[PDB]
Design an enzyme around this catalytic site. Sequence first.
Site, PDB file in Angstrom:
ATOM      1  N   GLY A  12       0.841  -1.181   0.000  1.00  0.00           N
ATOM      2  CA  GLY A  12       0.000   0.000   0.000  1.00  0.00           C
ATOM      3  C   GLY A  12       0.877   1.231   0.000  1.00  0.00           C
ATOM      4  O   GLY A  12       2.099   1.124   0.048  1.00  0.00           O
ATOM      5  N   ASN A  13       0.268   2.399  -0.037  1.00  0.00           N
ATOM      6  CA  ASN A  13       1.046   3.622  -0.043  1.00  0.00           C
ATOM      7  C   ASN A  13       1.368   4.121   1.342  1.00  0.00           C
ATOM      8  O   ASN A  13       0.717   3.757   2.328  1.00  0.00           O
ATOM      9  CB  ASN A  13       0.359   4.694  -0.839  1.00  0.00           C
ATOM     10  CG  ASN A  13       0.403   4.387  -2.296  1.00  0.00           C
ATOM     11  OD1 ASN A  13       1.463   4.028  -2.822  1.00  0.00           O
ATOM     12  ND2 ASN A  13      -0.715   4.513  -2.951  1.00  0.00           N
ATOM     13  N   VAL A 508      13.550 -14.045 -47.212  1.00  0.00           N
ATOM     14  CA  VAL A 508      14.868 -13.697 -47.729  1.00  0.00           C
ATOM     15  C   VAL A 508      15.037 -14.040 -49.191  1.00  0.00           C
ATOM     16  O   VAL A 508      14.825 -15.182 -49.584  1.00  0.00           O
ATOM     17  CB  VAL A 508      15.958 -14.435 -46.961  1.00  0.00           C
ATOM     18  CG1 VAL A 508      17.316 -14.087 -47.536  1.00  0.00           C
ATOM     19  CG2 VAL A 508      15.878 -14.063 -45.512  1.00  0.00           C
ATOM     20  N   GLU A 563      25.390  -9.340 -46.620  1.00  0.00           N
ATOM     21  CA  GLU A 563      26.338 -10.133 -47.397  1.00  0.00           C
ATOM     22  C   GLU A 563      25.842 -11.546 -47.651  1.00  0.00           C
ATOM     23  O   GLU A 563      25.439 -12.227 -46.712  1.00  0.00           O
ATOM     24  CB  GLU A 563      27.639 -10.275 -46.644  1.00  0.00           C
ATOM     25  CG  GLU A 563      28.412  -9.018 -46.377  1.00  0.00           C
ATOM     26  CD  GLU A 563      29.658  -9.354 -45.631  1.00  0.00           C
ATOM     27  OE1 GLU A 563      30.413 -10.158 -46.123  1.00  0.00           O
ATOM     28  OE2 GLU A 563      29.854  -8.853 -44.547  1.00  0.00           O
ATOM     29  N   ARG A 572      26.694 -28.320 -45.016  1.00  0.00           N
ATOM     30  CA  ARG A 572      26.663 -28.905 -46.333  1.00  0.00           C
ATOM     31  C   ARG A 572      28.028 -29.385 -46.742  1.00  0.00           C
ATOM     32  O   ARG A 572      28.161 -30.501 -47.227  1.00  0.00           O
ATOM     33  CB  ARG A 572      26.147 -27.935 -47.369  1.00  0.00           C
ATOM     34  CG  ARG A 572      26.094 -28.534 -48.765  1.00  0.00           C
ATOM     35  CD  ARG A 572      25.475 -27.624 -49.760  1.00  0.00           C
ATOM     36  NE  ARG A 572      26.258 -26.420 -49.990  1.00  0.00           N
ATOM     37  CZ  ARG A 572      25.838 -25.380 -50.737  1.00  0.00           C
ATOM     38  NH1 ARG A 572      24.657 -25.426 -51.311  1.00  0.00           N
ATOM     39  NH2 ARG A 572      26.605 -24.315 -50.903  1.00  0.00           N
ATOM     40  N   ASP A 609      23.978 -20.651 -29.988  1.00  0.00           N
ATOM     41  CA  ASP A 609      23.550 -21.537 -31.061  1.00  0.00           C
ATOM     42  C   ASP A 609      24.634 -21.956 -32.043  1.00  0.00           C
ATOM     43  O   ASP A 609      24.398 -21.944 -33.248  1.00  0.00           O
ATOM     44  CB  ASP A 609      22.422 -20.875 -31.851  1.00  0.00           C
ATOM     45  CG  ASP A 609      21.732 -21.839 -32.800  1.00  0.00           C
ATOM     46  OD1 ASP A 609      21.756 -23.016 -32.535  1.00  0.00           O
ATOM     47  OD2 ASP A 609      21.204 -21.397 -33.795  1.00  0.00           O
ATOM     48  N   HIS A 613      25.400 -25.373 -39.222  1.00  0.00           N
ATOM     49  CA  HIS A 613      24.375 -24.705 -39.982  1.00  0.00           C
ATOM     50  C   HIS A 613      24.538 -23.196 -39.926  1.00  0.00           C
ATOM     51  O   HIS A 613      24.063 -22.489 -40.810  1.00  0.00           O
ATOM     52  CB  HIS A 613      23.034 -25.083 -39.416  1.00  0.00           C
ATOM     53  CG  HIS A 613      22.835 -26.547 -39.444  1.00  0.00           C
ATOM     54  ND1 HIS A 613      23.377 -27.374 -38.482  1.00  0.00           N
ATOM     55  CD2 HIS A 613      22.173 -27.350 -40.303  1.00  0.00           C
ATOM     56  CE1 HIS A 613      23.057 -28.625 -38.752  1.00  0.00           C
ATOM     57  NE2 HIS A 613      22.326 -28.637 -39.851  1.00  0.00           N
ATOM     58  N   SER A 882      92.962 -40.344 -28.298  1.00  0.00           N
ATOM     59  CA  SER A 882      92.240 -39.341 -27.530  1.00  0.00           C
ATOM     60  C   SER A 882      91.322 -38.467 -28.392  1.00  0.00           C
ATOM     61  O   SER A 882      90.644 -37.582 -27.870  1.00  0.00           O
ATOM     62  CB  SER A 882      93.220 -38.451 -26.815  1.00  0.00           C
ATOM     63  OG  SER A 882      93.965 -37.699 -27.734  1.00  0.00           O
ATOM     64  N   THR A 883      91.328 -38.685 -29.709  1.00  0.00           N
ATOM     65  CA  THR A 883      90.544 -37.883 -30.654  1.00  0.00           C
ATOM     66  C   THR A 883      89.681 -38.771 -31.544  1.00  0.00           C
ATOM     67  O   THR A 883      90.106 -39.126 -32.645  1.00  0.00           O
ATOM     68  CB  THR A 883      91.434 -37.019 -31.567  1.00  0.00           C
ATOM     69  OG1 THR A 883      92.359 -37.849 -32.275  1.00  0.00           O
ATOM     70  CG2 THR A 883      92.203 -35.994 -30.754  1.00  0.00           C
TER      71      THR A 883
END
Length: 1084
Positions: A12-13, A508, A563, A572, A609, A613, A882-883
Site C-alpha cells: 500500500g502507499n 529472404v 552479405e 553442407r 547456437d 548450420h 684421444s681424438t
Amino acid sequence: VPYNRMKLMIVGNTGSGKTTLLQQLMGIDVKDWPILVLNVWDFAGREEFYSTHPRALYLAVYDLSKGQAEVDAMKPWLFNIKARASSSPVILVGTHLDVSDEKQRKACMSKITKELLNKRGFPAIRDYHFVNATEESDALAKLRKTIINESLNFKIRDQLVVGQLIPDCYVELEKIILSERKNVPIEFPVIDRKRLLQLVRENQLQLDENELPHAVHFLNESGVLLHFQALQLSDLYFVEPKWLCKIMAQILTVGIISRRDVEKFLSKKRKFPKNYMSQYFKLLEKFQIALPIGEEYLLVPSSLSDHRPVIELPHCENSEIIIRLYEMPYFPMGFWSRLINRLLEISPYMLLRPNRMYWRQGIYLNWSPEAYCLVGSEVLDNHPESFLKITVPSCRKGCILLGQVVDHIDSLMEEWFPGLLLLKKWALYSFNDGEEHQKILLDDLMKKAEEGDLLVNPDQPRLTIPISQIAPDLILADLPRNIMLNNDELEFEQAPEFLLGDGSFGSVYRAAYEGEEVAVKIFNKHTSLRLLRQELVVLCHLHHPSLISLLAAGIRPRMLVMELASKGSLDRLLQQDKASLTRTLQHRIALHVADGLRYLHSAMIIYRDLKPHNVLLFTLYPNAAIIAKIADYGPGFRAPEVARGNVIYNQQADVYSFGLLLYDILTTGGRIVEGLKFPNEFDELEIQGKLPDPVKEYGCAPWPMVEKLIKQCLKENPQERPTSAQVFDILNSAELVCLTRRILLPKNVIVECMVATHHASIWLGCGHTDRGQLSFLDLNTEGYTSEEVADSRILCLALVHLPVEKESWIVSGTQSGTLLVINTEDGKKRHTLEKMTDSVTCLYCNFLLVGTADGKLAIFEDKTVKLKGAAPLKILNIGNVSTPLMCLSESNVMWGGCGTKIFSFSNDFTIQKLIETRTSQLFSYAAFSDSNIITVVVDTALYIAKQNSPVVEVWDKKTEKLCGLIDCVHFLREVMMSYSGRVKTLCLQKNTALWIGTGGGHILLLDLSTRRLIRVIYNFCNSVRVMMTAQLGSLKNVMLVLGYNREIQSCLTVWDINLPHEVQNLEKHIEVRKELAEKMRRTS
C-alpha cells in the site's frame, strides 16, 4: 514432505498504517505468523524489492478517509502485482472508517466496482473489507477468516493450474536446508561455506548439477536466502535478506553524491571488503537505489527534486522542433528510475559533455543549441492519463537523439512492463508556425509512410507537411551514411526462384547490389518497423571480420541488404566434399569462428547456437584473408548445464558448444552429426558428455593439441571450462598446426639412437641399461617391442639397403667395438663383422663407414657386409686414441669431425684437407672453441656444433675461414637452469630452414639466408636427444624429434617439415585480419 509455509505480502502507499493492522491481526518488516505458518513481509516503506527482485497472498491496504484518489493510486500496485503474479490472490482493505463518512465508503465502493473489481489489467481482486481502526473490529474478525480461507482457496487454484496445494510435498532435503540456513551466526552474513554445510549435513541433494540449483531456486522463492543471479557477487555469495534490505535502505537515507564520500561513510558503517564494495555499488544500480553518473558519482534517483527546474530551450517556432507523446493511464512503479538509467548514455556523436539536469520525472541534456534533448512528464487538465514528452531540434543530430530515446523507451517496456504492450503514441504537428499543434497517432502516420506522401490537410490541399519532419524515425533518417540504401544499385525481383528462405520476420531473397551477390531480408507484414529498428540497433556497432555485415537498409520496402555467402554452410560442406576439407582449411575455419566468439563475448552477447548450420564459408581457398563467418549473431547441440532447463546462459555455454563444433570439424565425417538421425541417443550423449575417442572411434588421423583442446574445452564444470579469449589464444599457434603425432615411450626407456626405415617403423637403440638392447617402434599402430641383441651398449645404428639384392640389414655398432648386422626381413639372420680395435662412435652409409673412438675410419664395401667376419675395404687413421671420430656428413665429398679438426674425403677416401678449427678461439670463447666436434652440417658453408658449446660456428669451406657465429643463448636471452643454451643437434632443410635443438626443451628455427630467428619452439619436453629428417610411409616429410622428459620419461615427437613456413604464413594471416578489424570498426 507436505510443506505448510506461505508468504504474506502487505502493500500500500505511505501513510496507510497497515503495519499496525498486521499487529492487530496477529524497507520491510519480516516476521512469521503461525495460524499454517505465514512468512509475513510488511512493505511499509518504498522497498523497491517488489520490482527489483519480484506462494503468497497480497493484502492491499489503503486509507478510506483519503478516498477515491487513493484507490487510483493503488492501480500501479495492482499492475505490478498482476505483472509478476497474475494468479495470486488479492484482498483489498480500506481503513480508518471511524473517521470516514459512509459517503466515502460507498464512493470508493462504487469506484472499485466500476474500475477495479471488474477491470481487466488488474489481478482480479478476490475480496475486500472496510475497517474502522487498527484497535480491532468485527470487520477484522471477518478479514482474518477471509485471509485464511482465501489463502486456502489460492492454493487450491494453484493445484488447478500449477499442481500444488498448501500441503504440497517438496523434497524433504530442501526442507532440511531451510533449517540449516536458519541456524547461521555470521557477523557479515555473506555465504560461500554452504558447500561445506552441505558436507556437514552428510551430503543431501548430491546432484550438484540439478538438485543443488533447485534447492537454491526454492530458497529464493521461499524467502530463505538470496542469490543474485552478470554480477560477481552472485553465485557464491548468499546474503541474509535483513542486511540486504537494511543497509541499502539506510545508505539511501544517510542529490548528486560522490562515490568516494559514500565509500568513506560505508567503511565506517560496515567494514566490507573493497571487492564487496565494488559489488555493493553495482547492487545499488541493480536495485535502483543509486545510478552511476561519472565514475566518481551517483545520481540517487530517489529523493531527486520533484520540481522540474526552469529550462529555457533554444528554438520556439513550431517548425524548429520535433515533439513526441506517450499516453499512459499511470506510470509503473520504478518506470522513471529505469528510464533515466537508460537515457543517461545518449549521444549524437557516438556514431564535449552535456549540461545535464534532472527533474526526477525528466532529463535535460544540452550539448549544444545545435542538438539537445528534453524528456519529461507532463499532465493536462481533463486528461487523467499521464504522459511523456520528448523534444529535440529539427536537424540530423536532433533526429539521431530522438531515435535513441524512443528505442530505449520501447525496449524498456518490452522487458520490464509488458502488458502495456495503452501507450498511445502521438505525434504533434502544425501547418503553420504560430498556430496550435494537432495530434496524430503514429499508426496513421505509418499508413501514410507506406504511401510516401506528404501529410495533407484534408480540408486544404495547400497545407502540407513532409512526414520526415513529424516523424523522422518512421522513415529511417537516422542511419549512418554508410548504410543508406541506394535505390539505383539494388536489383531484385521477389520472385520464387530467388527465395533463399523465410521466417517469422518475413522472407529472404537473393539479389544484386553494386554488382555483388547479396541477401535481402524483407519485413513482409510482421509487426514491422519495430522489428526492423531492433535489428538495426544490433547490427550497427558490431563490426568484426568474422560476422555478417549489413550492406545498407531501406524503409521504402523495409529491407536489410546483407552479405551473401558464396560457398554456403559448413554443414553442407561436411556432408559434401571432404577433399576440400584439408588440414589447413580446417584450422583456418577454427580460427575464424573463435574470433567471432571472442568479439561477441566482449560485446556482452551470448550466441547460444553454434552449429555447422550457422557457419558460412566465403571461399574454400585455404590461403584467404576471410573464410568463415558466423550467421545471424545477436537443439541437440546444448551444453549439459543449460540442457537442464534450470540455469542461465553465459559465455561458458557458448564455449562448450564451440568445443562440440571443433569435435565436429575434427571428424570431417560429421559422425556425431550422423548420430542426430537417432536423436534419442544423440541429445543424451551430449548430456552424458561421454564422447568416444575421435581418432580410434572414427578412424580419424591424429591431431594432438586439438585433441586435448577439445578435452579441455568440454568439461562438465562451467567454472573449469576455458574462456573464449583463451580458446582463441590456443588456436593461434603454428605448433598447433604442424605437430602431427606424439608417442610416449614406456617408462624408464632411454633411446640413444634412431633409424627410420625409408620405405613405417623406427629402430631404436637403448642406453637405459648397460646391455646391448634393441627396440622397435611401429608408427602404424604405435606398437613397441624390444630384445637384447648384444653384450655391450649399442651406440650407433645404420641401415644397409640393398634393393638390388632385395634385402636390408641393421648395423649395430656398440661399446665393445663389434658390429652386429641383422637382416630386417629375418630376425634369425644375425652376424658379426670384423671387430674394431675400439668402440664404435658413428656409422654412415655404398660404403659402410665406421668411425671409432681411436680416430680410425673403416670403410666396408657395399655388399661385402652381408658376410660374417667380413673385413673392410680399407682403413684410415685420421685421429688418435684421444681424438675419436664423431661425425660423417655428406650433402660426393665427405666432411666430418675429429676432435677439433674438420676433415674431408675424396671418392678414393683420401684426405682432402684437415682444417684446424681451434683457431676460432680468437673469436667467442676458448673453452667453446676448443671442444670436440659433435656434428657437421654441409650446405654452402659448414655448420659446426661442438660438445657443450652454446655457439655454432660457420665456416667457409672454400677458403677455410671462420665466417660467423651463432649465439643460441642470445636467442633465448631475448625470450623471457633449463636455459642451458647447450647445442644438441643440427638439422638442415634446403628451403633455408635450420633446425637447432638444445639442452632444454627448445628448438630454434633459423633462416639460413639471413641468419635470423624465425621462431622458438618450446616447452617441448625436458631435453632434446636427437633429430631426424625422414619421409613417412605416406611420402610426407617430417621431423622426428626424440627427447627426454624427466621419472625418466622419453618420447618421440613428429613434426610436419613445413613448420618454418607455417610460422611465417600464420603470422601474416593474423596480422592482415587484425588490420581489417580496425578498418571496419573505425569506419562505423
